[PDB]
Design an enzyme around this catalytic site. Structure first.
Site, mmCIF file in Angstrom:
data_model
loop_
_atom_site.group_PDB
_atom_site.id
_atom_site.type_symbol
_atom_site.label_atom_id
_atom_site.label_comp_id
_atom_site.label_asym_id
_atom_site.label_seq_id
_atom_site.Cartn_x
_atom_site.Cartn_y
_atom_site.Cartn_z
ATOM 1 N N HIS A 41 0.715 -1.332 0.092
ATOM 2 C CA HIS A 41 0.054 0.055 0.073
ATOM 3 C C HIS A 41 0.869 1.284 0.207
ATOM 4 C CE1 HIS A 41 0.300 0.719 4.335
ATOM 5 N NE2 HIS A 41 0.169 -0.293 4.718
ATOM 6 N N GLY A 143 3.216 5.737 10.516
ATOM 7 C CA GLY A 143 4.560 5.619 10.190
ATOM 8 C C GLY A 143 5.202 4.128 10.354
ATOM 9 N N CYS A 145 4.315 0.999 9.665
ATOM 10 C CA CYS A 145 3.865 0.099 8.598
ATOM 11 C C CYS A 145 5.127 -0.337 7.915
ATOM 12 C CB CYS A 145 2.898 0.577 7.522
ATOM 13 S SG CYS A 145 1.184 0.366 8.265
HETATM 14 C C1 LIG Z 1 1.161 6.421 5.447
HETATM 15 C C2 LIG Z 1 2.373 5.997 5.660
HETATM 16 O O1 LIG Z 1 2.299 4.319 5.667
HETATM 17 C C3 LIG Z 1 2.172 4.022 6.819
HETATM 18 O O2 LIG Z 1 3.141 3.731 7.691
HETATM 19 C C4 LIG Z 1 0.796 3.475 7.436
HETATM 20 C C5 LIG Z 1 0.784 2.480 8.734
HETATM 21 C C6 LIG Z 1 -0.347 2.459 9.515
HETATM 22 C C7 LIG Z 1 -0.286 1.808 10.975
HETATM 23 C C8 LIG Z 1 -1.578 2.454 11.789
HETATM 24 C C9 LIG Z 1 -1.689 3.689 12.147
HETATM 25 C C10 LIG Z 1 -2.059 4.038 13.429
HETATM 26 N N1 LIG Z 1 -1.735 3.058 13.984
HETATM 27 C C11 LIG Z 1 -1.362 2.026 13.234
HETATM 28 O O3 LIG Z 1 -1.110 0.781 13.552
HETATM 29 N N2 LIG Z 1 -1.294 1.863 8.684
HETATM 30 C C12 LIG Z 1 -2.668 2.713 8.348
HETATM 31 O O4 LIG Z 1 -2.725 3.941 8.382
HETATM 32 C C13 LIG Z 1 -3.412 2.067 7.378
HETATM 33 C C14 LIG Z 1 -2.975 2.123 5.942
HETATM 34 C C15 LIG Z 1 -4.102 1.043 5.328
HETATM 35 C C16 LIG Z 1 -5.188 1.892 4.728
HETATM 36 C C17 LIG Z 1 -6.191 0.520 3.951
HETATM 37 C C18 LIG Z 1 -5.821 -0.920 4.163
HETATM 38 F F1 LIG Z 1 -6.743 -1.549 3.470
HETATM 39 C C19 LIG Z 1 -4.537 -1.358 4.552
HETATM 40 C C20 LIG Z 1 -3.526 -0.365 5.319
HETATM 41 N N3 LIG Z 1 -4.877 2.593 7.673
HETATM 42 C C21 LIG Z 1 -5.519 2.357 9.102
HETATM 43 O O5 LIG Z 1 -4.798 1.548 9.543
HETATM 44 C C22 LIG Z 1 -6.786 2.858 9.394
HETATM 45 N N4 LIG Z 1 -6.919 2.468 10.746
HETATM 46 C C23 LIG Z 1 -7.698 2.615 8.430
HETATM 47 C C24 LIG Z 1 -8.109 0.945 8.499
HETATM 48 C C25 LIG Z 1 -9.260 0.431 9.353
HETATM 49 C C26 LIG Z 1 -9.661 -0.994 9.444
HETATM 50 C C27 LIG Z 1 -8.972 -1.942 8.311
HETATM 51 F F2 LIG Z 1 -9.399 -3.045 8.211
HETATM 52 C C28 LIG Z 1 -7.939 -1.243 7.305
HETATM 53 C C29 LIG Z 1 -7.695 0.076 7.449
#
Ligand SMILES: CCOC(=O)CC[C@H](C[C@@H]1CCNC1=O)NC(=O)[C@H](Cc1ccc(F)cc1)NC(=O)[C@H](N)Cc1ccc(F)cc1
Ligand SMILES: *[C@@H](CC(=O)OCC)[C@H](C[C@@H]1CCNC1=O)NC(=O)[C@H](Cc1ccc(F)cc1)NC(=O)[C@H](N)Cc1ccc(F)cc1
Lengths: 305, 305
Positions: A41, A143, A145
């Site tokens: 992603h 940040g 991921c």
């Molecule tokens: C921008 C720089 O890149 C990163 O470093 C991003 C990592 C970060 C870790 C999080 C941040 C707060 N603490 C965590 O652990 N990941 C995200 O922001 C994910 C990104 C992503 C969207 C769509 C999807 F398909 C797969 C993944 N977005 C959600 O996590 C949100 N909650 C939305 C959400 C809710 C339920 C679900 F099943 C999927 C997405």
């Protein structure tokens, strides 16, 4: 003596962590030999969130659209491909700090260490369990991921987890290093829910053995039960059924302590039904389920790597 | 989201660990530049341990009574001296992996990571606090002496603890890297015991802040208090008194949550006087006191190294 949440030493994994940037988006990647692994992603924008056409997104990208940096030093990308939910970026420099490694898929109830990273730099290390509902109770911010989970088996690092997302309930979901999610999750932003979680019974029993090894024995009586009678109680308290295979895995701890597994089960049955009466076990007022039998042996016997 | 017992990444310290053998006795040492540091009781026999005459034992030994090994690599000893309770062995080759480092003496209540090692090889990493009674609740087995505690600041490793012994109560005592014991303890096998311990109030408050950041809010009440009133309740419950400098150190967490420190004190007062009533905070049924304010900021803001 003593018993702590202990993670594996992280150095072998620290030397593999890099930053991957595509457009405005930066996350972490794992640099092993001449390939960097990261969540696919990274190539998304917000227009893509519900229905990312990943093949389209990647076809539009050239090697120069990926900025990889190792300790803030740029590595040149020379190839890119996708495997399931992981992007594989071939770089022109092999990591001279690559440990002996394997990609493994862990089973629910098993544990691993997480090296939490931000912009390619490690923040801290902690121990997680793969929950029976295929989430982990992690500690992750924006940040994070691409942070990875791992066990060390001999001098081999077995990578088992790459972090992708946080569910609204505060728990976490991700993939193995071949990009296959744990659990019924996808990397599309549909509304996704985990199943109800249960308590990992075999791990609670292992932690009660840990307490006995450490001299914390107040909950021990000379009681015993049968596997079926134990399970009839366990399921009232949302504990996983205990199988004979689990009983077998507890052998080493039973051997060390002299406490038969079904005696420990009778103690656990009494704790569930009567509570802890204000007492603590290994410093906890709750029954802990994120230590495996191997974790207890490793810590109560001094295994090194 | 999430909150875990998080250690610092251990890579920089792993590269410093060696094995020290004197006759039949082997423990761990810390190899920094061309000096290896380790506990001086390596030069003893359990016959000495009542009243070890360390100066006599050390003067009688020659450099070749000391076998130092970095992995399988033997490091030739070219000098041996004592500084308080730590032996310093001068070796003929400087550790090429020496990080930027300092030796610090930590204060009661402050936390650090421990890299538990056996025979010079790292086994695991976990977080510890220096208790108000100058013991730590570690996880150590025979062979673990010379394991070290540290914090990281930027790229600087601040070594603060080296492990020496276990008290009969199951807690741990050791020295700083200048060889001075924390607390009143001495390295002779005489009956010794730690003062009664107390709870680290500023850390409990930092952890309540971590709970709010994470959406646990049930224990927040509308009241406020003063420092003077709160400290009366602190002494009732065997909590350390809170100082204005403690209040100020909680400022970053008050700033992020908008909960004034003295309102959090009021909430903790009511927790102390009415218990949790079968509720949990951050997955605990006890008030946790081994996270400092900086631990919570580091974890809930993503500080890296
Ligand atoms: C921008 C720089 O890149 C990163 O470093 C991003 C990592 C970060 C870790 C999080 C941040 C707060 N603490 C965590 O652990 N990941 C995200 O922001 C994910 C990104 C992503 C969207 C769509 C999807 F398909 C797969 C993944 N977005 C959600 O996590 C949100 N909650 C939305 C959400 C809710 C339920 C679900 F099943 C999927 C997405
Ligand atoms: C580390 C010693 C080592 O690795 O040498 C290799 C042979 C070891 C760490 C403990 C073992 C079990 N859990 C531990 O934390 N330290 C000791 O074994 C220590 C040796 C020692 C004897 C006398 C002294 F003054 C300092 C160190 N002995 C003990 O910890 C036991 N419990 C005896 C003891 C010593 C001092 C006390 F105040 C009370 C009990």
């Amino acid at each position: 003596s003593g018993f702590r949440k202990m993670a594996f030493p992280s150095g072998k994994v620290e030397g593999c962590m890099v930053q991957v940037t595509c457009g405005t988006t930066t996350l972490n990647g794992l640099w092993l030999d001449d390939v960097v692994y990261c969540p696919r992603h990274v190539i998304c924008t917000s227009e893509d969130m519900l229905n990312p056409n990943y093949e389209d997104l990647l076809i539009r990208k050239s090697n120069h659209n990926f900025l990889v940096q190792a300790g803030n030093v740029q590595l040149r990308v020379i190839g890119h491909s996708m495997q399931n939910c992981v992007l594989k970026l071939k770089v022109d420099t092999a990591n001279p700090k690559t440990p002996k490694y394997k990609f493994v898929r862990i089973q629910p109830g098993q544990t691993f260490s997480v090296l939490a990273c931000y912009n390619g730099s490690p923040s801290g290390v902690y121990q997680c369990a793969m929950r029976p509902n295929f989430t982990i109770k992690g500690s992750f911010l924006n940040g994070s991921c691409g942070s990875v989970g791992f066990n060390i088996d001999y001098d081999c690092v077995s990578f088992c987890y790459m972090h992708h997302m946080e569910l609204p309930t505060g728990v976490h979901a991700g993939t193995d290093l071949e990009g296959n999610f744990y659990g019924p999750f996808v990397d599309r932003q549909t509304a996704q829910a985990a199943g109800t979680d249960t308590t990992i019974t075999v791990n609670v029993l292992a932690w009660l053995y840990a307490a006995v090894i450490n001299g914390d024995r107040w909950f021990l009586n000379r009681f015993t039960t049968t596997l079926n009678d134990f399970n009839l109680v366990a399921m009232k308290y949302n504990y996983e059924p205990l199988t004979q295979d689990h009983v077998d895995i507890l052998g080493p701890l039973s051997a060390q302590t002299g406490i038969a597994v079904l005696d420990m089960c009778a103690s656990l049955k009494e704790l569930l039904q009567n509570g802890m009466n204000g007492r603590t076990i290994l410093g906890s007022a709750l029954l802990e389920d994120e230590f495996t039998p191997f974790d207890v042996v490793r810590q109560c016997s001094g295994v090194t790597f």
